[PDB]
From a paper:
Telaprevir potency was slightly better against D168A relative to the wild type, while danoprevir, vaniprevir and MK-5172 lost 100- to 1000-fold potency against D168A. Interestingly, telaprevir showed better potency against the D168A variant than the wild-type; the crystal structure revealed that the P2 moiety bent considerably and packed closer against the D168A variant. The inhibitor shifted by approximately 0.5 Å relative the position in the wild-type complex, resulting in increased interactions with both R155 and A156. Telaprevir has reduced potency against R155K due to loss of van der Waals contacts but exhibits better potency against D168A as it allows tighter packing in the S2 subsite. Thus, while telaprevir's flexibility allows adaptation to D168A, it cannot accommodate the disruption by R155K or A156T. Telaprevir and other linear ketoamide drugs select for A156T variants by direct steric clashes, while linear (BI 201335) and macrocyclic drugs (danoprevir, vaniprevir, TMC435) with large P2 moieties select for D168A variants by disrupting favorable stacking interactions with R155. These data also support the converse observation that D168A variants are uncommon in patients treated with telaprevir as the drug can pack tighter in the S2 subsite.
The HCV NS3/4A protease – a chymotrypsin-like serine protease – is a prime therapeutic target that cleaves four known sites along the virally encoded polyprotein. The NS3/4A protease also hydrolyzes two human proteins, TRIF and MAVS, which are part of the innate immune system, thereby confounding the innate immune response to viral infection. In this study, we report that four chemically representative protease inhibitors – telaprevir, danoprevir, vaniprevir and MK-5172 – exhibit distinct susceptibilities to the protease variants R155K, A156T and D168A. To elucidate the underlying mechanism by which chemically diverse inhibitors bind to the wild-type protease and drug-resistant variants, crystal structures were determined for 16 inhibitor-protease complexes. These complexes include wild-type protease and resistant variants R155K, D168A and A156T each bound to telaprevir, danoprevir, vaniprevir and MK-5172, with resolutions ranging from 1.10–2.50 Å; S139A protease variants were used except for telaprevir, which requires covalent bond formation with the serine 139 for efficient binding.
Residue numbers in the entry: 989 to 1181
Write the structure that this text describes.
């Protein structure tokens, strides 16, 4: 097995979103195998790694959420050693840990806006137009490479509240046309029986 390892962070507090890498490929390979990570955590969105993949994870209501197809049943490396998952929902493709010390949690969106904002792993903020429970159109199509690594990141309100967790793109010939996401309501259902 192995722990998922925070290799970075996205800050959404200020006027513009930015990414910081805080750990390289060699130091991440090391920390996955110990499960002990003494680095300072900050931000709403974390950049996380397994042995194969690098993607996002997002704190909402005190829980760091990401995708199950990326994270699996893995522990997360922390300053007190490896932390077990608090929630595992394979049906909803959703796993969550106790939000790490240092982090900030997003609030669930209560406004029902269909104007969403996808935060990518490069801290690009892309407008998405909500279409149903779990889908949204891209106002501009992108190469899927643009979104590769963003699984686990948030879709936001215009108010900066969590609408959902990005998990997949609908793609034709390497051009993403839409995004699929885990709605924040599903995260709420997961905590609430
Ligand atoms: C995300 O996990 C990530 O950042 N991973 C780190 C980089 C390694 C990653 C982000 C991709 C934009 N997500 C995925 O890889 C997801 C996962 C979760 C669900 C299945 C796999 C594949 N996947 C995708 O996003 C794919 N999308 C699809 O398979 C969609 N299907 C189509 O687009 C399609 C199918 N038939 C004909 C034409 N188009 C399905 C559609 C239904 C909902 C699930 C996604 C790719 C093709 C990788 C974009
Ligand atoms: Zn809202």
């Amino acid at each position: 097995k192995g722990s998922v390892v925070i290799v970075g962070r996205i800050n959404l507090s200020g006027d513009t979103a930015y990414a910081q890498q805080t750990r390289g490929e060699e130091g991440c390979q090391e920390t996955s195998q110990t499960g002990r990570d003494k680095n300072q955590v900050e931000g709403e969105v974390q950049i996380v790694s397994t042995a194969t993949q690098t993607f996002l994870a997002t704190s909402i209501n005190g829980v760091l959420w990401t995708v199950y197809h990326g994270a699996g049943t893995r522990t997360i490396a922390s300053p007190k050693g490896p932390v077990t998952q608090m929630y595992t929902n394979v049906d909803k493709d959703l796993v969550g840990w106790q939000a790490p010390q240092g982090s900030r949690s997003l609030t669930p969106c209560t406004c029902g806006s269909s104007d969403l904002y996808l935060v990518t792993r490069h801290a690009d903020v892309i407008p998405v137009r909500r279409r149903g429970d779990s889908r949204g159109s891209l106002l501009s199509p992108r190469p899927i490479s643009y979104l590769k690594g963003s699984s686990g990141g948030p879709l936001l309100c215009p108010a900066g509240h969590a609408v959902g967790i990005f998990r997949a793109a609908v793609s034709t010939r390497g051009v993403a046309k839409a995004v699929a996401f885990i709605p924040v309501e599903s995260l709420e259902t997961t905590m609430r029986s």
